[PDB]
Amino acid sequence: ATVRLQAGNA
Amino acid sequence: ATVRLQAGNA
Amino acid sequence: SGFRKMAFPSGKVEGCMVQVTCGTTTLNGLWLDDVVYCPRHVICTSEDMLNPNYEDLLIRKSNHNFLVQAGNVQLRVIGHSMQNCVLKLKVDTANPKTPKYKFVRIQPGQTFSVLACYNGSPSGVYQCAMRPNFTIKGSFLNGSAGSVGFNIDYDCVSFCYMHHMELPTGVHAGTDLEGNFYGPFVDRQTAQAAGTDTTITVNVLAWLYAAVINGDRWFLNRFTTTLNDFNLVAMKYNYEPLTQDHVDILGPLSAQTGIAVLDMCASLKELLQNGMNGRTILGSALLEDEFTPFDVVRQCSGVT
Amino acid sequence: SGFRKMAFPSGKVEGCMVQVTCGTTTLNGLWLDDVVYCPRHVICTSEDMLNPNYEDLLIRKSNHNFLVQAGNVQLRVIGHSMQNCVLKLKVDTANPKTPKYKFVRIQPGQTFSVLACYNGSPSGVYQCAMRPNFTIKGSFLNGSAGSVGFNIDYDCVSFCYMHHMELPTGVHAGTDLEGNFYGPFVDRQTAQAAGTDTTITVNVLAWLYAAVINGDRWFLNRFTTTLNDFNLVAMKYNYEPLTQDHVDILGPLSAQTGIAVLDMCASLKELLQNGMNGRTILGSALLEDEFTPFDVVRQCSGV
């Protein structure tokens, strides 16, 4: 499983 | 035992 | 992911906290527009708190007996009156930091954020539930009276609690902002005791949904139950009876996870009868009941 | 009395939180004086995130590619630079709400408050400990990157953490405010794992002292152990060894309660070997390790 960078989406 | 009112001392 | 006891951001309330001193007695006040609200026992000496008559005690006071301090600035008290267990001190300056606000009374089983303060200075913030027996399990020392509890919705602070006192069992009691006590308590240093508490069933179910959303699924099972059969078990374990309204309120979490409410009730029945057999749920070895369904949705969906 | 996981009041931090957007990628920034600090992966598109070359991605950006919003006010970016894993966006306006502040780097075992934010707007506050394996067990969703961790001392905000990402186990990783990761992690969407975690022994002892101050005494006993005999049990139960500095830090609580540190260690040893026998301590059926000695003193005394 991979790390999730936790920026969002606009 | 009694309730303690929780004001403080100046 | 993750799930924590999470308070509302406290900035809007910090701007309202002041210190109120009468004689050698001091505590916190809430400064909104040109009124400071505070617990009325600020007008007591230690000798007065066993059997005070607050009407008499306030008649014996004048405006100048109230020293009100916002930071370093002394506020001049131009009027004073009593409303139930709260004093209203009219001051000559309206608070420029007054947020949009409401005075609301909350229901047992609901949660709120406490801004603990001492000498008019905020010290920390934490979440509390109003227990079914109308106490709260807070963290309060001498000097904390007048700290307030609140929820925030959009820009509006809904004040629901003002802290007054600690019961001999170590739990806490206070009023709404109209000075009416939560629970069968009075502001005097007498022997008092709360009724027997119960566990908030709908909140335990909400937290189990939180756990599933976060990947804890070991307590799930294929069984289901009826509302009446569950409540039979709930009554044996000192849980609050579950109502159709509670089921309705859990609807969104049920839909999101795909676990029917009465299926999750079957899981709860199992946990009540067997325990967790050395396992944990969301880091806890006990069933947590101080998260409402709204608290779960707020945090697992990122409401601002 | 009572004892609660308690965060610092968040007002001074709320007034620093802004939104930073690059393309369709958005997160939170920290606005202090005329600089906005944010995680550098705001310059990643979705396709960039598996193997970004941040130097390349940044050289192709100019100031106007960074949209910074403080509430409804858009701040004009007049300069940018990369420091480790954070971006520094110079803006044309100094934050008039900048508190007195420091950038600090904390060590595993210490605690801090997190102001979780989305789209530049504060959402909630909770208390965290930095784990021995440098992760934190937070509560963070997509959009939460750039949320900060902090402590407050005499109206000075010590910023110690900026949030970046979530590991596959559901725990969280981030940097100090100079962009240096806590722990052996990098900001890309690869398979990464923290080291094996341990329990913060000095914090467990601090919380047992809190329990005593609050009237929970049932776990006390007549025994006293040695620092070495205890550490043998500690290593057996995946607890960090107790240092002399730890014993010294516990001094104020030992003196307040009149229970010597090594007297308390014998309680901890009994609890690790036998469990709680259906009982609770401060409302918990597990041994709690996310309260430091300072946290206990701050809450059980004064303010």
Side-chain angles (χ1 to χ4, degrees), chain C residues 98-131:
Chain C
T98 306
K100 189 194 175 240
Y101 77 92
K102 298 174 171 170
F103 286 174
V104 316
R105 183 179 182 96
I106 63 170
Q107 290 288 317
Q110 292 300 119
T111 56
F112 57 93
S113 301
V114 171
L115 181 68
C117 328
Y118 297 89
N119 307 295
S121 293
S123 58
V125 60
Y126 56 82
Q127 280 298 88
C128 278
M130 188 49 66
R131 308 290 328 159

PDB file of all heavy atoms in Angstrom, chain C residues 98-131:
ATOM      1  N   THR C  98     -17.001  40.539  20.241  1.00  0.00           N
ATOM      2  CA  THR C  98     -18.217  39.747  20.414  1.00  0.00           C
ATOM      3  C   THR C  98     -18.539  38.977  19.136  1.00  0.00           C
ATOM      4  O   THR C  98     -18.790  39.601  18.091  1.00  0.00           O
ATOM      5  CB  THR C  98     -19.410  40.638  20.772  1.00  0.00           C
ATOM      6  OG1 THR C  98     -19.101  41.440  21.924  1.00  0.00           O
ATOM      7  CG2 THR C  98     -20.624  39.772  21.072  1.00  0.00           C
ATOM      8  N   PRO C  99     -18.557  37.649  19.159  1.00  0.00           N
ATOM      9  CA  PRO C  99     -18.952  36.910  17.959  1.00  0.00           C
ATOM     10  C   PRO C  99     -20.468  36.907  17.821  1.00  0.00           C
ATOM     11  O   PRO C  99     -21.209  37.267  18.736  1.00  0.00           O
ATOM     12  CB  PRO C  99     -18.414  35.496  18.211  1.00  0.00           C
ATOM     13  CG  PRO C  99     -18.554  35.337  19.704  1.00  0.00           C
ATOM     14  CD  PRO C  99     -18.314  36.747  20.303  1.00  0.00           C
ATOM     15  N   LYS C 100     -20.927  36.485  16.649  1.00  0.00           N
ATOM     16  CA  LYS C 100     -22.319  36.074  16.545  1.00  0.00           C
ATOM     17  C   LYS C 100     -22.539  34.907  17.501  1.00  0.00           C
ATOM     18  O   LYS C 100     -21.743  33.965  17.532  1.00  0.00           O
ATOM     19  CB  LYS C 100     -22.651  35.687  15.096  1.00  0.00           C
ATOM     20  CG  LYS C 100     -24.132  35.439  14.828  1.00  0.00           C
ATOM     21  CD  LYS C 100     -24.364  34.734  13.494  1.00  0.00           C
ATOM     22  CE  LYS C 100     -25.840  34.388  13.298  1.00  0.00           C
ATOM     23  NZ  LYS C 100     -26.054  32.914  13.138  1.00  0.00           N
ATOM     24  N   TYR C 101     -23.592  34.977  18.318  1.00  0.00           N
ATOM     25  CA  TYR C 101     -23.734  33.962  19.353  1.00  0.00           C
ATOM     26  C   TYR C 101     -25.200  33.693  19.675  1.00  0.00           C
ATOM     27  O   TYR C 101     -26.100  34.465  19.330  1.00  0.00           O
ATOM     28  CB  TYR C 101     -22.977  34.346  20.642  1.00  0.00           C
ATOM     29  CG  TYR C 101     -23.685  35.395  21.481  1.00  0.00           C
ATOM     30  CD1 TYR C 101     -24.559  35.033  22.505  1.00  0.00           C
ATOM     31  CD2 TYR C 101     -23.477  36.753  21.241  1.00  0.00           C
ATOM     32  CE1 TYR C 101     -25.225  36.003  23.255  1.00  0.00           C
ATOM     33  CE2 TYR C 101     -24.123  37.715  21.979  1.00  0.00           C
ATOM     34  CZ  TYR C 101     -24.988  37.333  22.992  1.00  0.00           C
ATOM     35  OH  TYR C 101     -25.625  38.295  23.741  1.00  0.00           O
ATOM     36  N   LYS C 102     -25.411  32.581  20.376  1.00  0.00           N
ATOM     37  CA  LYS C 102     -26.713  32.180  20.893  1.00  0.00           C
ATOM     38  C   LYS C 102     -26.497  31.571  22.265  1.00  0.00           C
ATOM     39  O   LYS C 102     -25.445  30.984  22.528  1.00  0.00           O
ATOM     40  CB  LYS C 102     -27.387  31.110  20.030  1.00  0.00           C
ATOM     41  CG  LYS C 102     -27.716  31.494  18.608  1.00  0.00           C
ATOM     42  CD  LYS C 102     -28.241  30.261  17.882  1.00  0.00           C
ATOM     43  CE  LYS C 102     -28.797  30.589  16.509  1.00  0.00           C
ATOM     44  NZ  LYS C 102     -29.056  29.304  15.784  1.00  0.00           N
ATOM     45  N   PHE C 103     -27.516  31.665  23.115  1.00  0.00           N
ATOM     46  CA  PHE C 103     -27.563  30.939  24.376  1.00  0.00           C
ATOM     47  C   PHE C 103     -28.559  29.805  24.190  1.00  0.00           C
ATOM     48  O   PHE C 103     -29.773  30.043  24.116  1.00  0.00           O
ATOM     49  CB  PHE C 103     -28.019  31.827  25.533  1.00  0.00           C
ATOM     50  CG  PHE C 103     -26.995  32.806  26.020  1.00  0.00           C
ATOM     51  CD1 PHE C 103     -27.352  33.748  26.980  1.00  0.00           C
ATOM     52  CD2 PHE C 103     -25.711  32.821  25.517  1.00  0.00           C
ATOM     53  CE1 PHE C 103     -26.430  34.672  27.454  1.00  0.00           C
ATOM     54  CE2 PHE C 103     -24.773  33.729  26.000  1.00  0.00           C
ATOM     55  CZ  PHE C 103     -25.141  34.662  26.961  1.00  0.00           C
ATOM     56  N   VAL C 104     -28.050  28.579  24.114  1.00  0.00           N
ATOM     57  CA  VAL C 104     -28.885  27.415  23.865  1.00  0.00           C
ATOM     58  C   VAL C 104     -28.665  26.447  25.015  1.00  0.00           C
ATOM     59  O   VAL C 104     -27.579  26.391  25.596  1.00  0.00           O
ATOM     60  CB  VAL C 104     -28.552  26.765  22.510  1.00  0.00           C
ATOM     61  CG1 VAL C 104     -28.390  27.834  21.432  1.00  0.00           C
ATOM     62  CG2 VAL C 104     -27.298  25.915  22.622  1.00  0.00           C
ATOM     63  N   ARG C 105     -29.703  25.714  25.379  1.00  0.00           N
ATOM     64  CA  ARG C 105     -29.547  24.662  26.363  1.00  0.00           C
ATOM     65  C   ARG C 105     -29.435  23.338  25.623  1.00  0.00           C
ATOM     66  O   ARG C 105     -30.143  23.113  24.636  1.00  0.00           O
ATOM     67  CB  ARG C 105     -30.727  24.658  27.333  1.00  0.00           C
ATOM     68  CG  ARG C 105     -30.592  23.629  28.430  1.00  0.00           C
ATOM     69  CD  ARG C 105     -31.807  23.733  29.356  1.00  0.00           C
ATOM     70  NE  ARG C 105     -31.689  22.778  30.456  1.00  0.00           N
ATOM     71  CZ  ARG C 105     -31.216  23.063  31.658  1.00  0.00           C
ATOM     72  NH1 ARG C 105     -30.727  24.260  31.943  1.00  0.00           N
ATOM     73  NH2 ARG C 105     -31.242  22.122  32.604  1.00  0.00           N
ATOM     74  N   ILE C 106     -28.522  22.473  26.055  1.00  0.00           N
ATOM     75  CA  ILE C 106     -28.329  21.220  25.333  1.00  0.00           C
ATOM     76  C   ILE C 106     -29.049  20.089  26.036  1.00  0.00           C
ATOM     77  O   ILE C 106     -29.433  20.167  27.206  1.00  0.00           O
ATOM     78  CB  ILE C 106     -26.842  20.845  25.116  1.00  0.00           C
ATOM     79  CG1 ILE C 106     -26.162  20.623  26.481  1.00  0.00           C
ATOM     80  CG2 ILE C 106     -26.190  21.813  24.154  1.00  0.00           C
ATOM     81  CD1 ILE C 106     -24.781  20.028  26.359  1.00  0.00           C
ATOM     82  N   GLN C 107     -29.219  18.998  25.302  1.00  0.00           N
ATOM     83  CA  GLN C 107     -29.808  17.743  25.729  1.00  0.00           C
ATOM     84  C   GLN C 107     -28.737  16.807  26.289  1.00  0.00           C
ATOM     85  O   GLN C 107     -27.602  16.796  25.795  1.00  0.00           O
ATOM     86  CB  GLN C 107     -30.511  17.079  24.545  1.00  0.00           C
ATOM     87  CG  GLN C 107     -31.764  17.837  24.130  1.00  0.00           C
ATOM     88  CD  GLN C 107     -32.858  17.662  25.153  1.00  0.00           C
ATOM     89  OE1 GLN C 107     -33.073  16.553  25.645  1.00  0.00           O
ATOM     90  NE2 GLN C 107     -33.557  18.751  25.495  1.00  0.00           N
ATOM     91  N   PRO C 108     -29.096  16.038  27.315  1.00  0.00           N
ATOM     92  CA  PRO C 108     -28.231  14.945  27.759  1.00  0.00           C
ATOM     93  C   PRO C 108     -27.890  14.054  26.580  1.00  0.00           C
ATOM     94  O   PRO C 108     -28.751  13.737  25.755  1.00  0.00           O
ATOM     95  CB  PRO C 108     -29.086  14.199  28.789  1.00  0.00           C
ATOM     96  CG  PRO C 108     -30.486  14.693  28.581  1.00  0.00           C
ATOM     97  CD  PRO C 108     -30.356  16.093  28.083  1.00  0.00           C
ATOM     98  N   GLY C 109     -26.634  13.646  26.515  1.00  0.00           N
ATOM     99  CA  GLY C 109     -26.138  12.850  25.417  1.00  0.00           C
ATOM    100  C   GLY C 109     -25.455  13.642  24.323  1.00  0.00           C
ATOM    101  O   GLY C 109     -24.773  13.045  23.488  1.00  0.00           O
ATOM    102  N   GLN C 110     -25.616  14.957  24.306  1.00  0.00           N
ATOM    103  CA  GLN C 110     -24.964  15.825  23.343  1.00  0.00           C
ATOM    104  C   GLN C 110     -23.611  16.279  23.881  1.00  0.00           C
ATOM    105  O   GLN C 110     -23.339  16.229  25.086  1.00  0.00           O
ATOM    106  CB  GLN C 110     -25.851  17.035  23.021  1.00  0.00           C
ATOM    107  CG  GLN C 110     -27.100  16.668  22.272  1.00  0.00           C
ATOM    108  CD  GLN C 110     -26.796  16.005  20.949  1.00  0.00           C
ATOM    109  OE1 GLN C 110     -27.175  14.853  20.703  1.00  0.00           O
ATOM    110  NE2 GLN C 110     -26.122  16.738  20.076  1.00  0.00           N
ATOM    111  N   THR C 111     -22.756  16.719  22.967  1.00  0.00           N
ATOM    112  CA  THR C 111     -21.400  17.107  23.315  1.00  0.00           C
ATOM    113  C   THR C 111     -21.183  18.595  23.082  1.00  0.00           C
ATOM    114  O   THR C 111     -21.950  19.264  22.382  1.00  0.00           O
ATOM    115  CB  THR C 111     -20.382  16.320  22.494  1.00  0.00           C
ATOM    116  OG1 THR C 111     -20.670  16.523  21.107  1.00  0.00           O
ATOM    117  CG2 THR C 111     -20.457  14.836  22.819  1.00  0.00           C
ATOM    118  N   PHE C 112     -20.071  19.086  23.631  1.00  0.00           N
ATOM    119  CA  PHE C 112     -19.692  20.481  23.491  1.00  0.00           C
ATOM    120  C   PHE C 112     -18.227  20.631  23.866  1.00  0.00           C
ATOM    121  O   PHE C 112     -17.637  19.763  24.523  1.00  0.00           O
ATOM    122  CB  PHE C 112     -20.574  21.406  24.359  1.00  0.00           C
ATOM    123  CG  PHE C 112     -20.575  21.073  25.842  1.00  0.00           C
ATOM    124  CD1 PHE C 112     -19.695  21.697  26.722  1.00  0.00           C
ATOM    125  CD2 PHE C 112     -21.478  20.164  26.358  1.00  0.00           C
ATOM    126  CE1 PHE C 112     -19.717  21.402  28.093  1.00  0.00           C
ATOM    127  CE2 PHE C 112     -21.503  19.866  27.721  1.00  0.00           C
ATOM    128  CZ  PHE C 112     -20.615  20.484  28.588  1.00  0.00           C
ATOM    129  N   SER C 113     -17.644  21.752  23.434  1.00  0.00           N
ATOM    130  CA  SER C 113     -16.261  22.073  23.755  1.00  0.00           C
ATOM    131  C   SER C 113     -16.196  22.952  24.997  1.00  0.00           C
ATOM    132  O   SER C 113     -16.930  23.932  25.113  1.00  0.00           O
ATOM    133  CB  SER C 113     -15.594  22.802  22.588  1.00  0.00           C
ATOM    134  OG  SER C 113     -15.622  22.002  21.405  1.00  0.00           O
ATOM    135  N   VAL C 114     -15.265  22.641  25.891  1.00  0.00           N
ATOM    136  CA  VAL C 114     -15.038  23.448  27.085  1.00  0.00           C
ATOM    137  C   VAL C 114     -13.745  24.227  26.893  1.00  0.00           C
ATOM    138  O   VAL C 114     -12.705  23.632  26.584  1.00  0.00           O
ATOM    139  CB  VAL C 114     -14.956  22.574  28.346  1.00  0.00           C
ATOM    140  CG1 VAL C 114     -14.509  23.414  29.534  1.00  0.00           C
ATOM    141  CG2 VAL C 114     -16.323  21.904  28.626  1.00  0.00           C
ATOM    142  N   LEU C 115     -13.800  25.553  27.099  1.00  0.00           N
ATOM    143  CA  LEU C 115     -12.585  26.368  27.172  1.00  0.00           C
ATOM    144  C   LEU C 115     -12.315  26.588  28.661  1.00  0.00           C
ATOM    145  O   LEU C 115     -12.945  27.432  29.309  1.00  0.00           O
ATOM    146  CB  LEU C 115     -12.725  27.668  26.379  1.00  0.00           C
ATOM    147  CG  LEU C 115     -11.486  28.573  26.384  1.00  0.00           C
ATOM    148  CD1 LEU C 115     -10.369  27.885  25.599  1.00  0.00           C
ATOM    149  CD2 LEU C 115     -11.826  29.933  25.777  1.00  0.00           C
ATOM    150  N   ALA C 116     -11.401  25.792  29.216  1.00  0.00           N
ATOM    151  CA  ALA C 116     -11.053  25.950  30.623  1.00  0.00           C
ATOM    152  C   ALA C 116     -10.226  27.221  30.793  1.00  0.00           C
ATOM    153  O   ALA C 116      -9.279  27.468  30.032  1.00  0.00           O
ATOM    154  CB  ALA C 116     -10.272  24.733  31.125  1.00  0.00           C
ATOM    155  N   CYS C 117     -10.610  28.043  31.767  1.00  0.00           N
ATOM    156  CA  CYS C 117      -9.896  29.278  32.068  1.00  0.00           C
ATOM    157  C   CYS C 117      -9.731  29.480  33.559  1.00  0.00           C
ATOM    158  O   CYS C 117     -10.487  28.954  34.379  1.00  0.00           O
ATOM    159  CB  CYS C 117     -10.533  30.553  31.474  1.00  0.00           C
ATOM    160  SG  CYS C 117     -11.389  30.439  29.924  1.00  0.00           S
ATOM    161  N   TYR C 118      -8.722  30.294  33.876  1.00  0.00           N
ATOM    162  CA  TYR C 118      -8.364  30.680  35.230  1.00  0.00           C
ATOM    163  C   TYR C 118      -7.956  32.141  35.174  1.00  0.00           C
ATOM    164  O   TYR C 118      -7.208  32.532  34.270  1.00  0.00           O
ATOM    165  CB  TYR C 118      -7.223  29.803  35.773  1.00  0.00           C
ATOM    166  CG  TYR C 118      -7.637  28.361  35.869  1.00  0.00           C
ATOM    167  CD1 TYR C 118      -7.457  27.490  34.790  1.00  0.00           C
ATOM    168  CD2 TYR C 118      -8.271  27.881  37.005  1.00  0.00           C
ATOM    169  CE1 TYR C 118      -7.877  26.180  34.861  1.00  0.00           C
ATOM    170  CE2 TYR C 118      -8.692  26.583  37.090  1.00  0.00           C
ATOM    171  CZ  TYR C 118      -8.495  25.734  36.011  1.00  0.00           C
ATOM    172  OH  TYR C 118      -8.907  24.431  36.087  1.00  0.00           O
ATOM    173  N   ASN C 119      -8.499  32.950  36.092  1.00  0.00           N
ATOM    174  CA  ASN C 119      -8.183  34.380  36.175  1.00  0.00           C
ATOM    175  C   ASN C 119      -8.462  35.094  34.853  1.00  0.00           C
ATOM    176  O   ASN C 119      -7.756  36.025  34.462  1.00  0.00           O
ATOM    177  CB  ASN C 119      -6.730  34.590  36.617  1.00  0.00           C
ATOM    178  CG  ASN C 119      -6.408  33.835  37.892  1.00  0.00           C
ATOM    179  OD1 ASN C 119      -6.954  34.129  38.954  1.00  0.00           O
ATOM    180  ND2 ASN C 119      -5.529  32.845  37.789  1.00  0.00           N
ATOM    181  N   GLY C 120      -9.511  34.662  34.160  1.00  0.00           N
ATOM    182  CA  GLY C 120      -9.874  35.257  32.902  1.00  0.00           C
ATOM    183  C   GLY C 120      -8.999  34.873  31.728  1.00  0.00           C
ATOM    184  O   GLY C 120      -9.188  35.430  30.641  1.00  0.00           O
ATOM    185  N   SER C 121      -8.057  33.944  31.906  1.00  0.00           N
ATOM    186  CA  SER C 121      -7.132  33.545  30.845  1.00  0.00           C
ATOM    187  C   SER C 121      -7.377  32.107  30.420  1.00  0.00           C
ATOM    188  O   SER C 121      -7.228  31.185  31.235  1.00  0.00           O
ATOM    189  CB  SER C 121      -5.679  33.705  31.294  1.00  0.00           C
ATOM    190  OG  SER C 121      -5.366  35.073  31.464  1.00  0.00           O
ATOM    191  N   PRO C 122      -7.705  31.874  29.155  1.00  0.00           N
ATOM    192  CA  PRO C 122      -7.915  30.498  28.674  1.00  0.00           C
ATOM    193  C   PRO C 122      -6.678  29.638  28.869  1.00  0.00           C
ATOM    194  O   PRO C 122      -5.562  30.047  28.534  1.00  0.00           O
ATOM    195  CB  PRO C 122      -8.238  30.694  27.184  1.00  0.00           C
ATOM    196  CG  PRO C 122      -8.772  32.140  27.105  1.00  0.00           C
ATOM    197  CD  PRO C 122      -7.943  32.888  28.111  1.00  0.00           C
ATOM    198  N   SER C 123      -6.879  28.433  29.416  1.00  0.00           N
ATOM    199  CA  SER C 123      -5.779  27.493  29.624  1.00  0.00           C
ATOM    200  C   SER C 123      -5.813  26.271  28.715  1.00  0.00           C
ATOM    201  O   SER C 123      -4.748  25.766  28.354  1.00  0.00           O
ATOM    202  CB  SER C 123      -5.743  27.003  31.075  1.00  0.00           C
ATOM    203  OG  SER C 123      -6.969  26.392  31.424  1.00  0.00           O
ATOM    204  N   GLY C 124      -6.985  25.764  28.344  1.00  0.00           N
ATOM    205  CA  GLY C 124      -7.007  24.642  27.417  1.00  0.00           C
ATOM    206  C   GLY C 124      -8.410  24.357  26.937  1.00  0.00           C
ATOM    207  O   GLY C 124      -9.384  24.931  27.427  1.00  0.00           O
ATOM    208  N   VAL C 125      -8.509  23.455  25.961  1.00  0.00           N
ATOM    209  CA  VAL C 125      -9.794  23.129  25.355  1.00  0.00           C
ATOM    210  C   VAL C 125      -9.921  21.611  25.225  1.00  0.00           C
ATOM    211  O   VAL C 125      -8.935  20.910  24.967  1.00  0.00           O
ATOM    212  CB  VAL C 125      -9.964  23.853  23.996  1.00  0.00           C
ATOM    213  CG1 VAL C 125      -8.880  23.461  23.036  1.00  0.00           C
ATOM    214  CG2 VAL C 125     -11.317  23.556  23.409  1.00  0.00           C
ATOM    215  N   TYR C 126     -11.131  21.098  25.465  1.00  0.00           N
ATOM    216  CA  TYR C 126     -11.398  19.667  25.403  1.00  0.00           C
ATOM    217  C   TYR C 126     -12.900  19.452  25.246  1.00  0.00           C
ATOM    218  O   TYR C 126     -13.703  20.343  25.538  1.00  0.00           O
ATOM    219  CB  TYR C 126     -10.868  18.941  26.648  1.00  0.00           C
ATOM    220  CG  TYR C 126     -11.378  19.470  27.973  1.00  0.00           C
ATOM    221  CD1 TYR C 126     -12.631  19.095  28.475  1.00  0.00           C
ATOM    222  CD2 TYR C 126     -10.600  20.324  28.742  1.00  0.00           C
ATOM    223  CE1 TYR C 126     -13.082  19.583  29.691  1.00  0.00           C
ATOM    224  CE2 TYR C 126     -11.048  20.808  29.966  1.00  0.00           C
ATOM    225  CZ  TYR C 126     -12.285  20.430  30.430  1.00  0.00           C
ATOM    226  OH  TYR C 126     -12.733  20.905  31.648  1.00  0.00           O
ATOM    227  N   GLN C 127     -13.263  18.274  24.736  1.00  0.00           N
ATOM    228  CA  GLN C 127     -14.659  17.893  24.507  1.00  0.00           C
ATOM    229  C   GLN C 127     -15.259  17.253  25.748  1.00  0.00           C
ATOM    230  O   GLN C 127     -14.590  16.485  26.444  1.00  0.00           O
ATOM    231  CB  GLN C 127     -14.772  16.863  23.382  1.00  0.00           C
ATOM    232  CG  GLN C 127     -14.707  17.383  21.995  1.00  0.00           C
ATOM    233  CD  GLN C 127     -15.826  18.345  21.670  1.00  0.00           C
ATOM    234  OE1 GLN C 127     -15.689  19.534  21.913  1.00  0.00           O
ATOM    235  NE2 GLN C 127     -16.920  17.844  21.080  1.00  0.00           N
ATOM    236  N   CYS C 128     -16.562  17.501  25.958  1.00  0.00           N
ATOM    237  CA  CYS C 128     -17.347  16.912  27.037  1.00  0.00           C
ATOM    238  C   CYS C 128     -18.687  16.471  26.467  1.00  0.00           C
ATOM    239  O   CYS C 128     -19.201  17.086  25.531  1.00  0.00           O
ATOM    240  CB  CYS C 128     -17.610  17.918  28.183  1.00  0.00           C
ATOM    241  SG  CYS C 128     -16.235  18.050  29.332  1.00  0.00           S
ATOM    242  N   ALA C 129     -19.252  15.412  27.033  1.00  0.00           N
ATOM    243  CA  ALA C 129     -20.657  15.086  26.823  1.00  0.00           C
ATOM    244  C   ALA C 129     -21.452  15.454  28.071  1.00  0.00           C
ATOM    245  O   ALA C 129     -20.987  15.257  29.199  1.00  0.00           O
ATOM    246  CB  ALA C 129     -20.857  13.601  26.501  1.00  0.00           C
ATOM    247  N   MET C 130     -22.643  16.005  27.868  1.00  0.00           N
ATOM    248  CA  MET C 130     -23.625  16.090  28.947  1.00  0.00           C
ATOM    249  C   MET C 130     -24.087  14.671  29.287  1.00  0.00           C
ATOM    250  O   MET C 130     -24.733  14.019  28.457  1.00  0.00           O
ATOM    251  CB  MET C 130     -24.803  16.954  28.499  1.00  0.00           C
ATOM    252  CG  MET C 130     -25.841  17.298  29.610  1.00  0.00           C
ATOM    253  SD  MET C 130     -25.225  17.926  31.187  1.00  0.00           S
ATOM    254  CE  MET C 130     -24.562  19.483  30.632  1.00  0.00           C
ATOM    255  N   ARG C 131     -23.748  14.165  30.483  1.00  0.00           N
ATOM    256  CA  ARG C 131     -24.152  12.802  30.841  1.00  0.00           C
ATOM    257  C   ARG C 131     -25.666  12.702  31.010  1.00  0.00           C
ATOM    258  O   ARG C 131     -26.348  13.703  31.256  1.00  0.00           O
ATOM    259  CB  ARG C 131     -23.493  12.338  32.138  1.00  0.00           C
ATOM    260  CG  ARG C 131     -21.969  12.494  32.169  1.00  0.00           C
ATOM    261  CD  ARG C 131     -21.241  11.521  31.219  1.00  0.00           C
ATOM    262  NE  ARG C 131     -21.920  10.234  31.048  1.00  0.00           N
ATOM    263  CZ  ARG C 131     -21.703   9.440  30.005  1.00  0.00           C
ATOM    264  NH1 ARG C 131     -20.844   9.779  29.051  1.00  0.00           N
ATOM    265  NH2 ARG C 131     -22.347   8.272  29.921  1.00  0.00           N
TER     266      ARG C 131
END
